[PDB]
Amino acid sequence: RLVYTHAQTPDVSGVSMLEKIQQILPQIAKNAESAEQLRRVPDENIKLLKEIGLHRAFQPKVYGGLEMSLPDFANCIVTLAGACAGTAWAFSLLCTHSHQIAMFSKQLQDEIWLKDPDATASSSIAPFGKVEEVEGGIILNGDYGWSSGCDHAEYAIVGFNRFDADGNKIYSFGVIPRSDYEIVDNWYAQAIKSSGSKMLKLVNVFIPEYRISKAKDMMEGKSAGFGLYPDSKIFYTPYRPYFASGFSAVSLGIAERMIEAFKEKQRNRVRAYTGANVGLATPALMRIAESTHQVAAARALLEKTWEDHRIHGLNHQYPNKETLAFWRTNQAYAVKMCIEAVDRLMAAAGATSFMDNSELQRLFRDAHMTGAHAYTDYDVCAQILGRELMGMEPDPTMV
Amino acid sequence: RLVYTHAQTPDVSGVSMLEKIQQILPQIAKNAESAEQLRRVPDENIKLLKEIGLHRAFQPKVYGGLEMSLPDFANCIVTLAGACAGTAWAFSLLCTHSHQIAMFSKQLQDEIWLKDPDATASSSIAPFGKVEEVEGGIILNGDYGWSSGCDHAEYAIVGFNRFDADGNKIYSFGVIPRSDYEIVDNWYAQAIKSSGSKMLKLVNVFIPEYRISKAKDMMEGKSAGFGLYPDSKIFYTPYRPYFASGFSAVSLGIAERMIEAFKEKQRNRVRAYTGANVGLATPALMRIAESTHQVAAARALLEKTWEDHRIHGLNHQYPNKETLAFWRTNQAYAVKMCIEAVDRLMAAAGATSFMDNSELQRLFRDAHMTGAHAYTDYDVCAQILGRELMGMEPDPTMV
Amino acid sequence: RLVYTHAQTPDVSGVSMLEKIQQILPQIAKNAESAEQLRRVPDENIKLLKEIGLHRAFQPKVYGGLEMSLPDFANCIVTLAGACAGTAWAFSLLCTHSHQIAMFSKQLQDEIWLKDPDATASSSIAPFGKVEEVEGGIILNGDYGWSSGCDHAEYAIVGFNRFDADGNKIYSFGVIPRSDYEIVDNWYAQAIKSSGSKMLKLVNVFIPEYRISKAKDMMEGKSAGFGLYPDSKIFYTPYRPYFASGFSAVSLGIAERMIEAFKEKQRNRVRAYTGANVGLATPALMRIAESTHQVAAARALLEKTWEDHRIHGLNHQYPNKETLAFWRTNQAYAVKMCIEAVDRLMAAAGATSFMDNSELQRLFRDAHMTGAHAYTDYDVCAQILGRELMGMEPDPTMV
Amino acid sequence: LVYTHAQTPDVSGVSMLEKIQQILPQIAKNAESAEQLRRVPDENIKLLKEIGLHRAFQPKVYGGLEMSLPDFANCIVTLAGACAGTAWAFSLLCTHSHQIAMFSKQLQDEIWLKDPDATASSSIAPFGKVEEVEGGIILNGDYGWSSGCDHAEYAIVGFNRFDADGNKIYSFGVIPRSDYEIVDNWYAQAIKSSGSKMLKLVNVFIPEYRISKAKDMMEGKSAGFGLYPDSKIFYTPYRPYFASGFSAVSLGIAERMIEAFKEKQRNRVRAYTGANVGLATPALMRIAESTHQVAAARALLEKTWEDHRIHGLNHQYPNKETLAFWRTNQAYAVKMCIEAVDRLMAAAGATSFMDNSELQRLFRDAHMTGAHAYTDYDVCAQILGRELMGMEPDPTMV
């Protein structure tokens, strides 16, 4: 039988990563309230997740990595997000950054992972930094905000624009060690508080050429690390769809948890005005069903999209324009469905659900935040897909 | 690569049913306007569809049937509905009735198919008929409305209640020959006009016991025809999910066609008031994208659900309560999504789209009709699933 | 006490126009089915409406006109649209055209109304005609589509572009007699069938200068007829808001009728599947309530907007940019709300509601058509208002 | 008319609305510290009492204004744009006086001859345990969510008494500040500054003259009926005035959200592309649609408030149909306002969920307006639906 409401556990030999996630999930769930107040992922959470080996999901096998398929990894992030969304969001990125690093030069990867096989990077990819072309690389200055999981990373991936002969932008990534930047704690947010999305301060940071890759090169299989792992089912693919895969996975996990949490609270629900047991009233049952249907359809869309990624990576096949537009945008539609499904239940949840002692309130805020990321903006994604479907050239105003 | 916007053609070393449908589709599409005025499926349509052998999709192999999987059949109905929704709706039922008949006694099946291997049944399943218990069977009287494809069927399946010991209802089906009823032409409708959903008039019709099956028996593998086809991947399953599988397939096919038709009309769209080319304006592009996403998610949900049916039938496994509730209700949610996606485009289509000479108007009306069937009522389906998810007993008020 | 669900009848010594409409409404309602098949307003309808004097709503008092306030007239069109939407739509335009004509020269008005005080115009305002500048006027050629009520009008108002000393478009209107054009019957539509929105064929039609007005002049109180009626509470105002006021009035009336019709059908609704009396089930009651609230809010917004028009006309005050944008766009938002409210009920109405013998089907089609007019396109209206609210220059691409 | 906010009343001298507008920047600047304080700042209460808003529904004999419902509601709308919790708590401190005006002259004298500026907070859900003693009752219970309770001198408390038959008699008791403890358990994610703390009642004696039946105050049968024969506001059901502030707050949040979103949008740049994007088409259309939606919500509310005003003027108690509309229209308006807020929050970007953004506060507060028992739209849809279909009321909800 298939499962509509959550992930089917893989029927491989031994314990799958998903089962290991499920074993530690109650611990992650119990830490969620203090994680929220800590404004970063608790050390225990990172320790438990690294212990099961999730961080090595997209690390090359030569360094002791797993090279998990996208569907399998994404389902782990979904399940994790049900316990603590900020943990799942931050940890997802710590994981997906390794997929990117695997496309940099062998020398950078050796430098990161021969030293420390458990080392991860955080990131801040919006090109706000100022770049000076020196010889053998660049000097970078800037405040690099919203680096989820940055307190727990040994490196950071940082986005910047370099310039052509002509003066056209060359969007590039640089990998820098923890010692090259200061983490400034300005993370005071109303959602995914435990993600620890603090700012990275870069003062005259020298980045050597071998630690810089063009974004377009990593979209098109033209970076320094292309061809390093000829048996890989995951590295012969655009970087960005893997990088950003966790945002919608977190959204799905929140939404699936919201349904469960709402069902739990509903059973014993009484009317304050009349004293009537009201948990199983028709309007509430129909909201539960419709939100179940809506997130089941979101899950189905995501599962089909992840499978498409998996197939492309297996065949070492870079996607055409049409599938790329779907890969870019489907996840944003899924996020939009998940927020609707969460909102349909929050609207019927009563005043007690906005109290600090209610989980619903946390799920509600975190869900809305999944739709607030630049990559999940659906107005942008609708225009991207719409233009592609109509055979128009991409709008450079968005990406 | 996977396909988000329509069906992937089955990858075989032969011509699949889907490919054969695609070959005849332009003929079906060109007949759609006269089909609409005829208020029944044109003879040419039936001839073309029977010629490729689609009617034998769920007929047992012993009688020359195909025993198609549900996913493969449903995709044929989706594709067909893009050309003519009424044809797809009526023909789908002519096909799915054979799956039901395969659960009746060998004697009835022999009687239908040894005589004529190409014989089909239409139906009218709402138990409005009056039943007299005589010996060796019943006498049935009643007007049996909305029998799609009835002009083209040699038999009819008719629903009626028989009665306990206790005064309880026993919902039953009777298969009767064309000679036992009159087709009264009262089919004057505003959607799926070409379905020919005319009424069957039954005057003192004697139905012998061997041509009567209990509905519950055909839900639970307890009917006279159970175990007849031990190698079958499709008959060891509840009848109703196959019977009613075409409603949402038609809805999906209309919605996928609506997107294409809207895109075609949009390219050259000029503003009457200002004289400016407006086809590629941002609002229209975003509607196109969102309706594309919405029906892609509906397709994904349906494909997952059909796969679940296929797997259950393969294993001869009757579904548990939870999956049954999903099978019953997922299709209604998908219909609801498809109508939303159609409506999003119709709202932006302009006054010319409500003219008789526009296809959009036909797609719009036919789409809304798919949500109007008793089986696709989403209020009913939300209550059914909601109650099941909350561990409540089924509401006998609906089914 | 106030009324949320329909119009309050004006308290005046004497029978108000609204009461007179209410008296003849059952006759209009009973003619609706044959009106639909006739594809134009039945002679009896025109006769009844002219008998109560509604056509003289916006005709100057000097010619025997009423000079009704916009709110009072709009409520008559709302009530009328509950009986027959096509009649209300066509007749509304026959009425509002007189407001426009009142801004042309005294000579044209004398020519129309001294001859025949009961004479009306239809229109086709999209500037598709080809214009030759001759002396003393123009020669116009073109097919002028969608002229609602044209079979019953003695004149037509026709839109065309003239050109500047410098080649800039001068959007203009010409009033021509019935003898100058052929009505071509190409009116085959799926909504407001009884509007008789046939095409006007113009072959080398000479229009003298005194029968031509600039649109901008009639927006800004600069046309030949400005200042003719110094005591008027209605003529010192932009022409367009009155011209186009009937589209949303018709939408409101359809929506208010749909609620009533749905309530009537619901009372006795039995389940075909089970036999239970289901008319008063919770989901249906909530749809009834929400559609009641939604159209009450639409009515409230329209009433406030009509009052704003009434006040401006009373004071002879031409609206500023902000109020003009609201006048232009509020009606389109109201139409959008009314269609949502109709759709919420149609979705729960069952298969019998799509039969030709059901009124719901007619209300459903006609409602959607109200959202299909160029003036009620909400994508256009959202951009118009949005740009104004943000202090941006108007987009010439729309109007 | 004005579509986007209230028209200021044209009177000689200053209207209450103008006075609200004068103090609004002070209320707005206090909103962040009000949020952290988890109650209305003393300065806010002082400013609002100084302009005399608390005396809106107090009888004229005690120095009250007897404001019309529309005029009062528009003051709460405007106030909610600056601080939603302040508006929400203060609205209730104001509307309670309308209720108190239906109690006995003796209770009113006792409250207002003593202190003309005295107000009540409330907790109306009948969770308390009642002992019938003689000359009144003894009440025990935890009475949660009493907005503005730190600033009130009295509390109105809801409880069930019983019939000869054992039937529920839903009643209200007015008790002094000295008879209860304010327990600070107010830790919420919206309207934080409302200070909706709990009232602890331990063996509180309430004398009969301080108890009124809810139904009596719905039907003009309470002890205070007929006390103010010239009043344009007291010959009316209590509950529609009591609960009028919830939707007023929702409207004010929504109208502010539009303004705040417009302000942030002007200079908006894409992080990934560095393009000025504030005036892009999708954002303009969201601004317009949210403007239309809250304009229609305002129009519906204004019409409903006018209907209340007219009924009160004529001393006319509403029939069943208008009562159902009065009960439910405000909940539909709240639902529209939240949609309008959500349409803008969905396009607002990640910076809008930071603590230093106002949008985040408006978003949370808006959703909370839809979370009150009186604004539950599922309940309201059933109430209206049943009435429209000629069915008897469902006792399961009210």
- CA of A176, closest CA in chain B: separation in Å? 36
The verdict on a CB contact (< 8 Å) between A399 and D272 is yes
Architecture per CATH, domain C215-399, reads as: Up-down Bundle (1.20)
Q: Find, in chain D, the residue whose alpha carbon is nearest to that of A278.
A: D396
Q: Do D253 and D80 form a contact (C-beta atoms < 8 A)?
A: yes
For C338-386, the DSSP string reads: HHHHHHHHHTTS-GGGGBTT-HHHHHHHHHHHHTSSTTT-HHHHHHHHH
Quick check: helix, strand or coil at residue A170?
Answer: strand
Q: Among D189, D274, D282, whose Cβ lies nearest the Cβ of A379?
A: D282
**Could you tell me how far CA D19 lies from the centroid of its own chain?**
19
Quick check: helix, strand or coil at residue C388?
Answer: helix
Structural gaps in chain A: residues followed by a C–N separation over 2.5 Å:
none
Q: Where are the alpha helices (DSSP H) in A155-281?
A: 215-220, 239-243, 246-266
Residue C130 φ then ψ, to 5°: -95, 130
Q: Which of B313, D266, D292, A357 is closest to C304 using CA atoms?
A: D292
Rounded Cα–Cα distance for residues D123 and D145 (Å): 6
Angle, in degrees to the nearest 10, between helices B321-346 and B359-370: 150
User: Is D290 a known ligand-binding residue?
Assistant: no
Q: Among B280, B317, B337, whose Cβ lies nearest the Cβ of A297?
A: B337
Tokens 């096509």 -> residue: C86
Beta bridge partners, A132, equal A139
Q: What is the CATH number of domain D214-398?
A: 1.20.140.10
β-pairing verdict for C155-163 and C121-124 = parallel
The verdict on a CB contact (< 8 Å) between C356 and B189 is yes
Structure tokens at B47: 């001839």
* DSSP secondary structure letter of residue A152: G
- CA of A356, closest CA in chain C: separation in Å? 32
Mutate to test the interface with A, among C282, C285, C287, C379 (most CBs of A within 10 A): C282
Q: Which of B23, B69, B14 is closest to B232 using CA atoms?
A: B69
Q: Find, in chain D, the residue whose alpha carbon is nearest to that of B286.
A: D282
For B217-278, the DSSP string reads: HHHHT-STTTTS-TT-SSSSS-HHHHHTTHHHHHHHHHHHHHHHHHHHHHTT-B-TTT--B-
Mutate to test the interface with C, among A278, A280, A282 (most CBs of C within 10 A): A282
Mutate to test the interface with A, among B285, B307, B336 (most CBs of A within 10 A): B285
Angle, in degrees to the nearest 10, between helices A321-346 and A246-266: 20
What percent of chain B is helix, strand and coil (3-state, nearest 5)? Answer: 50, 15, 35
The verdict on a CB contact (< 8 Å) between A385 and B292 is yes
Structure tokens at C294: 């939604």
Structural domain boundaries of chain B?
1-119, 120-214, 215-399
Rounded Cα–Cα distance for residues D8 and A149 (Å): 51
Q: Does the CB of B321 have a partner CB in chain A at under 8 Å?
A: no
Q: Does the CB of B277 have a partner CB in chain A at under 8 Å?
A: no
For D234-292, the DSSP string reads: SSS-HHHHHTTHHHHHHHHHHHHHHHHHHHHHTT-B-TTT--B-TT-HHHHHHHHHHHH
- Calculate ∠ Cα D8-D13-D18, nearest 5°: 35
Chains contacting chain B through 3 or more C-beta pairs under 8 A: A, C, D
Ramachandran class of D226: left when φ > 0, alpha when ψ lies in -120 to 50, beta otherwise: left
Rounded Cα–Cα distance for residues B330 and B341 (Å): 17
Rounded Cα–Cα distance for residues D289 and C337 (Å): 12
Q: Which are the contacts of D86, defined by CB distance < 8 A and separation ≥ 6?
A: D27, D30, D31, D34, D40, D41, D44, D48, D79, D193, D194
Q: Does the CB of C354 have a partner CB in chain B at under 8 Å?
A: yes
Structure tokens at C18: 């609204």
Architecture per CATH, domain D1-118, reads as: Orthogonal Bundle (1.10)
What's at B372, amino acid-wise? A
Rounded Cα–Cα distance for residues B351 and C374 (Å): 8
Rounded Cα–Cα distance for residues D171 and D173 (Å): 7
Q: Find, in chain B, the residue whose alpha carbon is nearest to that of A286.
A: B382
User: Is B153 a known ligand-binding residue?
Assistant: no
- CA of D278, closest CA in chain A: separation in Å? 12
Q: Alpha-carbon Rg of chain A, whole angstroms?
A: 21
The 10 Å CB-count burial string (b at 16+, else e) for C374-396 is bbbbbbbbbbbbbbbbbeeeebe
User: Is D138 a known ligand-binding residue?
Assistant: no
Q: Terminus-to-terminus CA distance in chain D, angstroms?
A: 36
- CA of A286, closest CA in chain C: separation in Å? 9
Task: Tell me which chain C residues have a C-beta less than 8 angstroms from the C-beta of A283.
Answer: 282, 286
Q: How many CB pairs under 8 A join C and D?
A: 133
Q: Among D284, D289, D296, whose Cβ lies nearest the Cβ of C298?
A: D296
Task: Tell me which chain A residues have a C-beta less than 8 angstroms from the C-beta of C282.
Answer: 282-283
Quick check: helix, strand or coil at residue D136?
Answer: strand
CA dihedral B331, B336, B340, B342 (to 10 degrees): 50
Written out in words, the top-level CATH class of the domain with range A120-214 is mainly beta
* DSSP secondary structure letter of residue B141: E
Structure tokens at A307: 């499978």
Q: Which of C370, C399, C361 is closest to C92 using CA atoms?
A: C370
Tokens 């003051």 -> residue: D75
Structure tokens at D65: 């204004």
Rounded Cα–Cα distance for residues A49 and A26 (Å): 13
Architecture per CATH, domain D119-213, reads as: Beta Barrel (2.40)
Rounded Cα–Cα distance for residues B385 and C9 (Å): 47
Structure tokens at B276: 């400016």
Q: Does the CB of C320 have a partner CB in chain D at under 8 Å?
A: no
Q: Topology of B1-119 in CATH?
A: Butyryl-Coa Dehydrogenase, subunit A; domain 1 (1.10.540)
**Could you tell me how far CA C16 lies from the centroid of its own chain?**
20
Task: Tell me which chain C residues have a C-beta less than 8 angstroms from the C-beta of A288.
Answer: none
Q: Do D360 and D378 form a contact (C-beta atoms < 8 A)?
A: no
Rounded Cα–Cα distance for residues A5 and A26 (Å): 19
Rounded Cα–Cα distance for residues D352 and D305 (Å): 34
Rounded Cα–Cα distance for residues C389 and B282 (Å): 19
- CA of C373, closest CA in chain D: separation in Å? 19
Task: Tell me which chain B residues have a C-beta less than 8 angstroms from the C-beta of D285.
Answer: 283
User: Is B316 a known ligand-binding residue?
Assistant: no
Q: Which of B215, B196, B140, B191 is closest to B376 using CA atoms?
A: B191
Task: Tell me which chain C residues have a C-beta less than 8 angstroms from the C-beta of A285.
Answer: none
Task: Tell me which chain A residues have a C-beta less than 8 angstroms from the C-beta of D350.
Answer: 146, 369, 372-374
Q: CA separation (Å) from C259 to A42, A279, C5, C89?
A: 56, 30, 9, 20
- Calculate ∠ Cα A174-A327-A11, nearest 5°: 100
Q: Does the CB of D359 have a partner CB in chain A at under 8 Å?
A: no
Strand ranges (E), chain B: 121-124, 130-134, 137-147, 155-163, 169-177, 182-184, 198-208, 212-214
Q: Does the CB of A142 have a partner CB in chain D at under 8 Å?
A: no
Helix or strand (DSSP H, E) at A198: strand A198-208
Q: Does the CB of D339 have a partner CB in chain A at under 8 Å?
A: no
